[PDB]
């Protein structure tokens, strides 16, 4: 989707944040945000501009205003530029080549920010500005507030917290504006997507269909694919690769490709065309079979992640009306739709259960279970597997009670997003370290090692007391 959110970092240089110094963790948070952005999304833009210095590096040459990074996609060079001033020696060298606190005007810095925002040549979905100062400085104040209001009217968002901590110093900026602790790299390796799956037609019957918007919500994440860069020049090769004639010499052709499967006595030689046409059974869409109760489910037959189904009022108008009716009926009916589904041409059909997904808006109106249906794959006969019989022994009421007492002592709310992949996190951290010429960044287990290893004594372990077998079962 076109348009992104633009955030620019503005930090005062008034020799008041030089004394940990506010400038220090301000720079640290800016670096952490830039790292999170470069690991999250590259379509966004970042800009670093300073004011109050003794140097006037800016396009219109305004006093004390210094620009360091203009609005551009995040880059490692910007990270190094930030890091060269991160340290205390970095702070003093920064103050040397930039200049210490001097006179300025907030109208000028807002004007420069507006010019920088206008400099971009892309549709830019949102415009936000982050500002940092310990205390409010403010004539100058009147013009500054007027210009800030004008920019806010133009569609510019502002953000700031005083760097003293509490809720004490925002007096001169009470009206100017329309917390950075969470921005301190608390989020890492985020993934952002804006597109949607292929919209199809709901073949509910033989004549009328519904334009259905397919949406994936929990699709599996994976590391980005590697590139085959050269050893010395460190740039990828054209990667030319296709089968040619080796035994006889020469070049092979796609028309020369014959496919076969050696079965029994002879190899049934064919061509590809038969192979793709074999995969063809019907047209893309969801051919509805009927309704079947949700209670009539094996409750353990998941095979492929579910996909959300939404109306798309772009090819038929009945999508929204009929889906709203069905969802209303989904209150009274617990039967689920049975559909033969094919994402595209030459795909074997799968039987699909449309579990009612009714919207559950919370106090903040979070779209929990968005209004529509989810695709539930139904396994075939071959998808099932045999299982050797096991009906040896049951349990005793004493044992089940003891196990209940052991387990319900430890309970968790199960926050869904509480876990991330340690492999992907470590991979991202390694790439970050290599891109910045550093040591091993850190290791942080995503609760993969159970915390019960230390709090088992806290929960009062009793299965150790209850060894049902004289010979140790846990040998």
């Amino acid at each position: 989707y076109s348009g992104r959110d633009s955030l620019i970092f503005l930090v005062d240089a008034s020799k008041a944040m030089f004394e940990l110094t506010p400038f220090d963790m301000s720079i640290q948070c800016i670096q952490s945000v830039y790292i999170s952005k470069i690991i999250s999304s590259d379509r966004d833009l970042l800009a670093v501009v300073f004011y109050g210095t003794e140097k006037d590096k800016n396009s219109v040459n305004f006093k004390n205003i210094y620009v360091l990074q203009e609005l551009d996609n995040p880059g490692a060079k910007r990270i190094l530029e930030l890091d060269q001033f991160k340290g205390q020696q970095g702070q003093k060298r920064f103050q040397d080549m930039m200049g210490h606190g001097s006179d300025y005007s907030l109208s000028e810095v807002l004007w420069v920010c507006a010019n920088l925002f206008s400099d971009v040549q892309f549709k830019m979905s949102h415009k936000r500005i982050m500002l940092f100062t310990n205390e409010d400085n403010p004539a100058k104040a009147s013009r500054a507030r007027t210009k800030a209001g004008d920019l806010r009217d133009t569609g510019i968002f502002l953000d700031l917290m005083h760097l003293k901590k509490g809720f004490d110093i925002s007096l001169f900026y009470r009206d100017i504006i329309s917390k950075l602790e969470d921005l301190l790299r608390k989020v890492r390796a985020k993934e952002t997507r804006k597109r949607a799956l292929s919209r199809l037609k709901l073949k509910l019957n033989k004549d009328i269909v519904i334009s259905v918007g397919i949406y994936n919500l929990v699709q599996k994440a994976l590391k980005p694919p590697p590139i085959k860069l050269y050893r010395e020049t460190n740039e990828p090769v054209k990667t030319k690769t296709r089968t040619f004639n080796t035994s006889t010499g020469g070049l092979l052709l796609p028309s020369d490709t014959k496919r076969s499967q050696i079965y029994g006595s002879r190899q049934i030689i064919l061509e590809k065309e038969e192979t793709e046409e074999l995969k063809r059974f019907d047209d893309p869409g969801l051919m509805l079979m009927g309704f079947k109760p949700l209670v009539l489910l094996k409750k353990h037959h998941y095979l492929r992640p579910s996909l959300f189904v939404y109306p798309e009022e772009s090819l038929v108008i009945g999508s929204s009306t009929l889906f709203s009716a069905l969802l209303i009926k989904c209150l009274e009916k617990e039967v689920a739709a049975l559909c033969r589904y094919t994402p595209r041409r030459n795909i074997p059909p799968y039987f699909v259960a449309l579990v009612p997904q009714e919207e559950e808006l919370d106090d903040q109106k979070i779209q929990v279970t968005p209004p529509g249906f989810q695709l539930v794959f139904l396994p075939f006969a071959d998808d099932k597997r045999k299982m050797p019989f096991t009906e040896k022994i049951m349990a005793t009421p004493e044992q089940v009670g003891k196990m209940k007492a052991i387990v319900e002592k430890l309970r968790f709310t199960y926050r869904s997003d509480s876990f991330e992949n340690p492999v992907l996190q470590q991979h991202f951290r390694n790439l970050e370290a290599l891109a910045l010429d550093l040591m091993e960044p850190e290791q942080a287990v995503d609760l993969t090692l159970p915390k019960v290893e230390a709090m088992n004594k806290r929960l009062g372990s009793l299965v150790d007391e209850f060894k049902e077998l004289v010979y140790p079962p846990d040998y």
Binding site: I38, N73, A76, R193, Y215, N216, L217, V218, A221, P224, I227, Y230, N234, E235, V237, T239, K240, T243, T246, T248, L253, D256, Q267, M289, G290, L296, H301, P305, T321, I328, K329, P348, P349, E359, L378, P379, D382, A395, T396, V400, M403, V407, R411, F412, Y414, S416, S418, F419, N421, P422, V423, D446, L447, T448, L449, N456, S461, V463, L469, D474
Partner: protein
């Protein structure tokens, strides 16, 4: 095949277990053999690359490549030998369980992975078998689902997973399904539908839909004999692609 490992409930108190691939999207047994046009065998058939340098016809070999990654505006060089130490280290074929929650919090919607495991105990370990039976009965009674950090082997990947038992008169075990990582939680804001003043279904449409639902019931209704029978059992039909 079985997955002979140990259920690490708690710090120690491990329980011998064996797991099997229960439900899986089946693949074809034999892949197509691309044979020669006229010889119909593998003489001029081979998979190979040139790795020509992007230039003017200079090329490169396997030792000449570096597995870089697109770090946004640029590509940082990296190699598999670097991956050898710059990777997460697993601990064997562990079955570490870490958390316990209520079955209400989890969702059939949030069932991820690409396989199903019937979490059985080990072979003829009566003490472990009865302990597992007691644990699964307790979990079922309290609807108290378990969180499992799973790894197939030393070279596998960590896998958060949900555990809830299955009870029958012929087989009794625990069902394991891979839980997500927060990266997988893709979000897409959607407009509400029940408040669609522009598209509000008429009550005549509502009653027609009710009649349609009643007519196209694909399962026998539970009578006095509890005849909740699937008139169209999909699970007992093999994939038509193979036939």
């Amino acid at each position: 095949i079985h997955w002979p490992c140990r259920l690490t409930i708690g710090s120690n108190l491990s329980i011998r277990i064996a797991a099997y691939k229960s439900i899986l999207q089946e693949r074809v047994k034999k892949t197509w053999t691309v044979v020669d046009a006229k010889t119909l065998k593998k003489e001029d058939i081979q998979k190979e690359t040139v790795y020509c340098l992007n230039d003017d016809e200079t090329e490169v070999l396997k030792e000449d490549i570096i597995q870089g990654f697109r770090y946004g505006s640029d590509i940082v060089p990296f190699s598999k030998v670097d991956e050898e130490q710059m990777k997460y280290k697993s601990e064997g074929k562990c079955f570490s369980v870490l958390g316990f929650c209520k079955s209400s919090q989890v969702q059939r919607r949030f069932f991820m992975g690409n396989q199903v495991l019937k979490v059985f105990a080990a072979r003829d370990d009566e003490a472990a078998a009865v302990a597992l039976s007691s644990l699964i009965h307790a979990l079922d009674d309290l609807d108290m689902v378990a969180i499992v950090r799973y790894a197939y082997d030393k070279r596998a990947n960590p896998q958060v997973g949900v555990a809830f038992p299955h009870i029958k008169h012929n087989y009794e075990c625990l069902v394991y399904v891979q839980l997500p990582f927060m990266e997988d939680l893709r979000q897409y804001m959607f407009s509400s539908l029940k408040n669609s003043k522009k598209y509000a279904p008429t009550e005549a449409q509502l009653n027609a839909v009710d009649a349609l639902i009643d007519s196209m019931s694909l399962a026998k209704k539970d009578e006095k004999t509890d005849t909740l029978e699937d008139l169209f059992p999909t699970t007992k039909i093999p994939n038509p692609r193979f036939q």
